[PDB]
Design a protein around this ligand. Structure first.
Ligand SMILES: [Ca+2]
Ligand SMILES: [Ca+2]
Ligand SMILES: [Ca+2]
Ligand SMILES: [Ca+2]
Ligand SMILES: [Ca+2]
Ligand SMILES: [Mg+2]
Ligand SMILES: [Mg+2]
Length: 335
């Protein structure tokens, strides 16, 4: 209700009147999609994009915060941000020497990339990827995390958008990050490759050719359940490709580690271990025999006696597929 009065204050000579309006519009935009639409309907977006060119760092800080929380809404809400000419201004802020401005620009770009394929492509077309791939080599963990988050959401799009990430030279940087001692960076690098591996066979072969599999197979032996869940998701998407892709997974030695995970009392790890083996089972007779030789038949048959309906179904489906004769993830950040 008080929103139109706030939009008028975004172009005020009084700095204390301008900052109070920005702080309030940022707090409203942190709410639901119904609240975000009220900000857009008040015509805040044209005024907010204009403020990104302001030399004032305090104004630009809250202007980015407001746009980021608006960008964390629905697909139509994200589209309204793009129509206001936000992307060409956000891409220019990636080359900024200010760490707070760069962090907030990346936060805004990641939420826009959390929308549909049309929205993701608009970010690619704006020239975001070359800067994003460059940031994967940064010594700053706060910035590296944000760029990893934005690249994961772009890779959550269609095959055209995933190929654009591969072409920008992201895979060698992502594969290198799989050996990082930082668990947050490691999780996001795993989340990025998983979304890349959810694409076509050519895109999955790109992940294999970059040398990601030895690290992913190794991560199945981790005591950390968060890293285990991400590695299982990445390998499942790789195993969903062709017979060349399934065999690369077997050659990397995933089967003995996957069969070991069938003994886990954790329902999340189990479901993902079953899904990875089920995709492998949907390969040729050479691929089917490899699963049999790993000792999987014994555990799959025993898992058909589990009290969990989902665990029961997956185990039977995988055991049937062993007879002789792809998931994308998006994340929206609200602060
Ligand atoms: Ca003044
Ligand atoms: Ca600086
Ligand atoms: Ca550092
Ligand atoms: Ca660590
Ligand atoms: Ca643990
Ligand atoms: Mg950290
Ligand atoms: Mg952890």
């Amino acid at each position: 209700s008080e929103l139109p009065q706030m939009v008028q204050q975004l172009n005020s000579p009084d700095q204390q009147e301008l900052q109070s309006a920005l702080r309030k519009l940022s707090q409203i935009a942190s709410g639901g999609n119904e609240q975000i639409q009220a900000v857009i309907d008040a015509g805040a977006l044209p005024a907010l994009v204009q403020l990104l060119s302001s030399p004032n760092e305090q104004i630009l800080q809250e202007a980015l915060w407001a746009l980021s929380n608006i960008a964390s809404g629905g697909n139509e809400q994200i589209q309204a941000v793009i129509d206001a000419g936000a992307l060409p201004a956000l891409v220019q802020l990636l080359s900024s020497p200010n760490e707070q401005i760069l962090q907030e620009a990346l936060w805004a770009l990641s939420n826009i990339a959390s929308g549909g394929n049309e929205q993701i492509q608009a970010v690619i077309d704006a020239g975001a990827l070359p800067a994003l791939v460059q940031l994967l080599s940064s010594p700053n963990e706060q910035i590296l995390q944000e760029a990893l988050w934005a690249l994961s959401n772009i890779a959550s799009g269609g095959n055209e958008q995933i190929q654009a990430v591969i072409d920008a030279g992201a895979l060698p940087a992502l594969v290198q990050l799989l050996s990082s001692p930082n668990e947050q960076i490691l999780q996001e690098a795993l989340w990025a490759l998983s979304n890349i591996a959810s694409g076509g066979n050519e895109q999955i072969q790109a992940v294999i050719d970059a040398g990601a599999l030895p690290a992913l197979v190794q991560l199945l032996s981790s005591p950390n359940e968060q890293i285990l869940q991400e590695a299982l998701w990445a390998l499942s998407n790789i195993a969903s490709g062709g017979n060349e892709q399934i065999q690369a997974v077997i050659d990397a030695g995933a089967l003995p580690a996957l069969v070991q995970l069938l003994s886990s009392p954790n329902e999340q790890i189990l479901q993902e271990a079953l899904w990875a083996l089920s995709n492998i089972a949907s390969g040729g007779n050479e691929q089917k025999q490899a699963v049999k030789e790993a000792g999987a038949l014994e555990k799959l048959e025993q898992l058909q006696s589990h009290e969990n309906e989902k665990i029961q179904k997956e185990a039977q489906e995988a055991l049937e597929k062993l007879g002789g004769g792809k998931r994308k993830r998006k994340r929206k950040r609200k602060r």
